Amino acid sequence: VNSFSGYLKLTDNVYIKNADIVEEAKKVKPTVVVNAANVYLKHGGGVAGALNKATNNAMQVESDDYIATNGPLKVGGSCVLSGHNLAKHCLHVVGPNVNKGEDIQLLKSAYENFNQHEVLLAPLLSAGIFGADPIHSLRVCVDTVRTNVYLAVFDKNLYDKLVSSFL
Ligand SMILES: Cc1cccc(C[C@H](CO)Nc2ncnc3[nH]ccc23)c1
Secondary structure, eight states: OOOOOOOESSSEEEEESSSSSHHHHHHOOSSSSEEETTTTTTOOOOHHHHHHHHHHTHHHHHHHHHHHOOOOOOOOOOEEEEEETTTSSSEEEEEGGGGGTTOOOOHHHHHHHHGGGGGGOOOOTTGGGGGGOOHHHHHHHHHHHHHHEEEEEEHHHHHHHHHHHHH
C-alpha cells in the first residue's frame, strides 16, 4: 500500500491521473519523482522547468554541479539527484526530443531507467514540447516499465485522449 490517490489502473504496474506532477510530488513526497530532462540538465521549461521552479532553483544549482563534474547525459540515459522539497530523489531521464531531431526509438531505452526503482511518480516522457506522440509514449511505458509507475498527466484534454485510446 502507498499514498498515491485517485489513479486509474491501466495494467498490473502502471497507473495514471490528470494532475500536475509538481502537485503530486508536493502531496505524496514520493521516494522518486522523474524529471523529463535534457542531456545538459537545463531545466528551462515543460516538466523540468516546473519541477525546478518548485525547488526555488535548487534543482538547477545541483544539476550545474553534476554537469561540471560528469559532462552531459546520453539521450536515453538518466542520473539520480536530490528530490529537494518534492521527493527523496529525482531521477532525471532524457527521452528523445523530436523537435531536436532525436531518434524516437531511444524512448524505450529512456523508460528502462525506471526499472531501477520499485515505485516512481513520473511524467509521460518525450510528450509535450519534446514532440513525440503521447499515445505511443504511454504504450512504450506500459510495454517497458515493470516496476510500479504512477503517471501524472497535467493536460486534461490529453489525459482524456490517453484513457479513451488505451488498449
Ligand atoms: C516532456 C514534456 C514536456 C512538456 C509537457 C509535457 C506534457 C505533460 C502532460 O500534459 N506535462 C506535464 N505533465 C505532468 N505534470 C506537469 N507539470 C507541468 C507540466 C506537466 C511533457
